[PDB]
Design a binder for this molecule. Structure first.
Ligand SMILES: *[C@@H]1O[C@H](CO[C@@H]2O[C@@H](C)[C@@H](O)[C@@H](O)[C@@H]2O)[C@@H](O[C@@H]2O[C@H](CO)[C@@H](O[C@@H]3O[C@H](CO[C@H]4O[C@H](CO)[C@@H](O)[C@H](O)[C@@H]4O)[C@@H](O)[C@H](O)[C@@H]3O)[C@H](O)[C@H]2NC(C)=O)[C@H](O[C@@H]2O[C@@H](C)[C@@H](O)[C@@H](O)[C@@H]2O)[C@H]1NC(C)=O
Ligand code: NAG
Ligand code: CA
Length: 412
């Protein structure tokens, strides 16, 4: 149908997947959920209102799945942690299944806004995590960071910690935009540091403290300390480096880019086989940086990119063909192997572009012949196109070093 990766004439152009809420309809894995072991009373103030949380009944259950489901206008389904007068180390983990480039992470809390939480991302499918924003009324003591550290050109990946969520304008909704206040934001397409900043395969929210212990048996106030949230939204695009308009499931089940521009890899981050004439690049407004096919004059199955050759060509071509067949030779299989010669009547792409020199081994000095006329390298006294007969005045000797000696009594 419509390929947004080529313009109406067919020229390659930059293309990106559509911007989505990439959290939506994906599992969130909570470290703790109320009503898991036994019913649990929890209470929220508005007058105080208590409910029972029991995971065995749908009307009483608050699983993490509620975080990325469809919400009704006055009916927000909320996940709820287990009431404890000592709540901490409670985490939510979301797998995107694929690298995305993220614009924002939004959290819509239900009861109270948590005092201290940390946002992390992974870019290796959960193997490792780095922070990217903190929230706390005591950044220094809790998270070992100064509050509201200024972002300069020399710390654009700063993971800021702030207490400004507390009476913030979003109320119970907290949104972190990845590019806000980043100096290189307007130069994103030429900012590897920012391109790294916004790349993630997973997100993780870690809650450390509900309140600074500033907010009747203890079973009663226990029913007020709990984490609770109804909407986890992660806005971004599937990362394809400008070389795909959509991501798909291939026939092996992998979620991956629908790579265009003769690229390959799950992120279109390398060139396809036999497309190694130019270095890979990310597409930009100026140019798609489409990978370029090697030229092996129909004589080679594989090729490789040689960077120094590319730099010597004037940054034009850099593919080196591998194992040229059919007695061809050269980095483009554009020449003839030693002992062969360019059959001019056929094209270089023909399976018989290079015909044997046919040089008679005894009368010639080398197997290789004149690449233009085919004439072989004749020893003294030898003549012929392939140096296979003695010249006038010479006669076949016995030695194979000098097979033609002068004829005695023959005038020269
Ligand atoms: C918020 O939304 C939920 C989910 O309902 C869906 O979403 C809303 C937005 C709307 O689009 C609905 O049409 C959707 O279905 C509401 O919960 C649902 O409420 C209705 C009416 O009370 C209830 O229907 C009865 O179901 C009985 C059987 O119940 C059991 O079986 C179901 C199927 O296995 C389970 O899903 C259910 O949990 C029970 O275990 C049946 O005998 C009756 O004849 C009705 O048909 C739905 O089952 C119920 N879905 C649930 C609980 O998952 C919320 O409604 C609120 O909660 C329930 C418990 C009542 O107290 C409601 O009166 C109350 O309003 C809704 N909250 C709002 C609107 O404030
Ligand atoms: C929090 O829980 C994890 C998972 O068991 C554990 O590895 C970690 O040590 C706990 N505490 C802290 C302070 O990280
Ligand atoms: Ca919800």
């Amino acid at each position: 149908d419509h390929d947004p990766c080529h313009d109406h004439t067919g020229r390659p152009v930059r293309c990106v997947p559509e911007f989505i809420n990439a959290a939506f309809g994906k599992p969130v894995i909570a470290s703790d959920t109320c009503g898991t072991n036994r019913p649990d009373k929890y209470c929220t103030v508005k007058r105080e209102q208590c409910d029972t949380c029991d995971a065995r009944n749908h009307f009483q259950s608050h699983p993490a799945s509620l975080l990325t489901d469809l919400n009704s206008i006055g009916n927000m389904t909320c996940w709820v942690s287990t009431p404890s007068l000592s709540p901490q180390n409670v985490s939510l983990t979301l797998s995107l299944g694929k690298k995305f480039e993220l614009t924002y992470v939004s959290m819509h809390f239900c009861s109270r806004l948590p005092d201290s939480m940390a946002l992390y991302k992974s870019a290796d499918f959960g193997k490792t995590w780095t922070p990217f924003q903190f929230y706390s009324s005591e950044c220094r003591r809790i998270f070992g960071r100064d509050p509201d550290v200024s972002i300069t050109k020399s710390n654009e990946q700063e993971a800021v910690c702030t207490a400004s969520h507390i009476m913030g304008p979003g109320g119970n909704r907290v949104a972190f935009p990845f590019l806000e206040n980043r100096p290189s934001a307007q130069n994103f397409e030429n900012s590897p540091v920012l391109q790294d900043w916004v790349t993630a395969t997973d997100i993780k929210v870690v809650f450390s403290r509900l309140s600074p212990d500033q907010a009747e048996t203890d079973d009663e106030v226990k029913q007020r300390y709990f984490y609770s949230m109804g909407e986890l939204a992660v806005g971004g695009r599937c990362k394809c480096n400008g070389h795909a308009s959509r991501c798909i499931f291939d026939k092996m089940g992998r979620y991956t880019c629908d790579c265009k521009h003769n690229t390959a890899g799950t992120e279109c981050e390398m060139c396809k086989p036999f497309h190694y004439d130019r270095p890979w690049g990310r597409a930009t407004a100026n140019s798609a940086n489409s990978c370029v096919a090697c030229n092996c004059n129909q004589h080679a199955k594989r090729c490789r990119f040689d960077a120094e050759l590319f730099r010597l060509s004037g940054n034009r071509s850099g593919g080196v063909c591998l194992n040229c067949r059919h007695n061809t030779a050269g980095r483009n299989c554009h020449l003839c192997k030693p002992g062969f010669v360019r059959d001019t009547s056929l094209p270089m792409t023909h399976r018989k572009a290079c015909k044997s020199c046919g040089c008679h081994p005894v009368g010639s000095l080398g197997k290789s012949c004149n690449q233009s006329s085919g004439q072989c390298v004749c020893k003294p006294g030898v003549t012929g196109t392939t140096c296979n007969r003695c010249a006038k005045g010479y006669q076949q000797s016995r030695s194979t070093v000098t097979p033609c000696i002068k004829i005695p009594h023959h005038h020269h």
